[PDB]
């Protein structure tokens, strides 16, 4: 509607018998290939990302937002758990870090 890309804001400019809109949009660029999984298996339970996708740099699995690469370690705070680990097809086995165990010890 307002320009190509994800619309941020627009500025009107008057013209003789019309209007000129300056559509400021956000265009993603410089993409990288990755490997994804629908969910992460940990303790016989399936973990889905609250907001983002599971990506791996070939060795380690990360949780990143979907429009900008900012990988983060898969914790129990940026994922949610639903069901056992045998119904989702494409599950990968990995560890879901817990921010409560390290303090306890």
């Amino acid at each position: 509607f307002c320009g190509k890309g994800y619309h941020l804001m627009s500025f009107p400019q008057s013209a003789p018998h019309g209007v000129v809109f300056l559509h400021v949009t956000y265009v993603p660029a410089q993409e990288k290939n990755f490997t994804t999984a629908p969910a992460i298996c940990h303790d016989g339970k399936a973990h889905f990302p609250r907001e983002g996708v599971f990506v791996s740099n070939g060795t380690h699995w990360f949780v990143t937002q979907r429009n900008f690469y900012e990988p983060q370690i898969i914790t129990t705070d940026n994922t949610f758990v639903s069901g056992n680990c045998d119904v989702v097809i494409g599950i990968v086995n990995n560890t879901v870090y817990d921010p409560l165990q390290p303090e306890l010890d």
Binding site: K4, V27, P28, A29, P38, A46, G83, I89, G90
Partner: protein, 174 residues
């Protein structure tokens, strides 16, 4: 081709040039209309030869490389249901985009939304597995991802059956 008529017609001035200018003006925008509907893709996106989309079957919307213009099955069904000169001054000018190129536009628009999602309309086309595309589109309507992932095989069957019924409702109902 009556000279005594054409000389008399000059007495009315510039009606004839006005009428041709108006008809040419509405003949150019007939091509603009098609251009702004279909020519919305920067590039001609292609579908992977191996078609594993998590159980989703886009065989009746994707092109067939045996049919005329490589039309899809529903597109061919559509072009056989509508099918129901120059004498003196009348001249039908051909469309700028042939049906083959419009079919290529709709194939690229359709192969980019299967592989890349809605990202190819906002920048660089970013690939994503189709099941995971359905998961984020389920997020868009307020349903969590696990509802798609735990019901993937039901959802794919429902989608395939619904496409099959579009085919039937078009192939029969006049």
């Amino acid at each position: 081709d009556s000279t005594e008529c054409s000389n008399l017609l000059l007495q009315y001035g510039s009606f004839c040039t006005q009428l041709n200018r108006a008809l040419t003006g509405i003949a150019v925008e007939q091509d603009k209309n098609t251009q702004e509907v279909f020519a919305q893709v920067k590039q001609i996106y292609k579908t992977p030869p191996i078609k594993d989309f998590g159980g989703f079957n886009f065989s009746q919307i994707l092109p067939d490389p045996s049919k005329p213009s490589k039309r899809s099955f529903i597109e061919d069904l559509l072009f056989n249901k509508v099918t129901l000169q120059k004498f003196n001054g009348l001249t039908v000018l051909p469309p700028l985009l042939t049906d083959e190129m419009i079919a290529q536009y709709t194939s690229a628009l359709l192969a980019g939304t299967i592989t890349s999602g809605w990202t190819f309309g906002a920048g660089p086309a970013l690939q994503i597995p189709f099941p995971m595309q359905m998961a984020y589109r389920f997020n868009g309507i307020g349903v969590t991802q696990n509802v798609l992932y735990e019901n993937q095989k039901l959802i794919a069957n429902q989608f395939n059956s619904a496409i099959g019924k579009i085919q039937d409702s078009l192939s029969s109902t006049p």
